[PDB]
Amino acid sequence: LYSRKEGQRQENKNKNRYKNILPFDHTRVVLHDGDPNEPVSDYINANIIMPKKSYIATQGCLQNTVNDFWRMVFQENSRVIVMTTKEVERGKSKCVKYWPDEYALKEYGVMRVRNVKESAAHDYTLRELKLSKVGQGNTERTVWQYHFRTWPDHGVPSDPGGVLDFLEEVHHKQESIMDAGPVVVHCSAGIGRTGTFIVIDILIDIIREKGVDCDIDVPKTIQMVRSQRSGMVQTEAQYRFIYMAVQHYIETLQR
Numbered sequence: 001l002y003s004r005k006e007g008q009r010q011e012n013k014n015k016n017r018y019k020n021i022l023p024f025d026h027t028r029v030v031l032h033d034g035d036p037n038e039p040v041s042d043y044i045n046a047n048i049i050m051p052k053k054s055y056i057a058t059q060g061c062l063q064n065t066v067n068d069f070w071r072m073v074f075q076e077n078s079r080v081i082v083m084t085t086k087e088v089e090r091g092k093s094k095c096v097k098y099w100p101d102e103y104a105l106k107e108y109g110v111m112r113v114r115n116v117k118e119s120a121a122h123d124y125t126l127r128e129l130k131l132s133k134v135g136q137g138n139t140e141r142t143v144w145q146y147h148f149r150t151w152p153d154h155g156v157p158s159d160p161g162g163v164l165d166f167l168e169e170v171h172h173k174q175e176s177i178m179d180a181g182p183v184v185v186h187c188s189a190g191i192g193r194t195g196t197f198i199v200i201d202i203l204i205d206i207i208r209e210k211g212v213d214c215d216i217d218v219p220k221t222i223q224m225v226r227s228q229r230s231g232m233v234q235t236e237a238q239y240r241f242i243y244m245a246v247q248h249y250i251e252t253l254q255r
């Protein structure tokens, strides 16, 4: 019932970091208004994830998909990006740098991005970016990139505190922007770490609207996000991290 033909088309072969990890057609983010000279330009290995708050689970940029990444961010009107990995972890590239150096500006295809300010927080770096379309005039918007940089090289964090505080900030930022689009979340392949942050965010939100005693069904929620992007939450450790995060959150609310 869930096909992934687009990601399998020959023209999009190099647009996937891992030939085996592709987006479902029914939930894939379809990019419009691309270079007419490109055989195919409506593809990006990204899927919309909905539990009015949604997410875009995607892979880290490849050198040849950076422009597509910004087209997506602009198209979906996303104002918040959650990068969950370093650019390189254990000698493996997990995302090409898709943002300009601090105070610098770079043009990605028809998208102009200005890094206006970088700030350091505990477990993360926040980059305030200005995104606009070169051909237009009233398209500029701030995109807040939250770069979580303390995720361990191996396994998952032993304590969920850092991710929860991180997500709390992300949450506050998203709600401080009028009608911001889906929060973009990415990791190497866009399913393991990415799935973990999203599932946690989804569960925490439910607790924020139903109280510390509402029913919480992790397995159910995970299967729900998985019907929108396959493989979300790849390891036992990640699975357990989610359980720990929810509880830790509940226990924090209980004063």
Ligand SMILES: Cn1c(-c2ccccc2)c(-c2cn(CCC(=O)Nc3ccc(-c4ccccc4)cc3)nn2)c2cc(C(=O)O)c(O)cc21
Pocket (backbone or CB within 6 Å): 089, 090, 091, 092, 151, 155, 187, 188, 189, 191, 192, 193, 194, 238
């Ligand atoms: C896409 N991928 C991969 C990955 C899976 C297969 C091949 C390459 C990367 C890992 C991930 C998972 N393991 C532990 C599982 C294991 O015993 N075999 C193993 C796989 C790769 C390496 C490895 C790590 C660095 C360089 C070269 C090989 C070592 C052990 N190591 N690396 C991963 C982790 C996360 C995360 O949550 O942090 C993620 O979001 C995506 C991941």
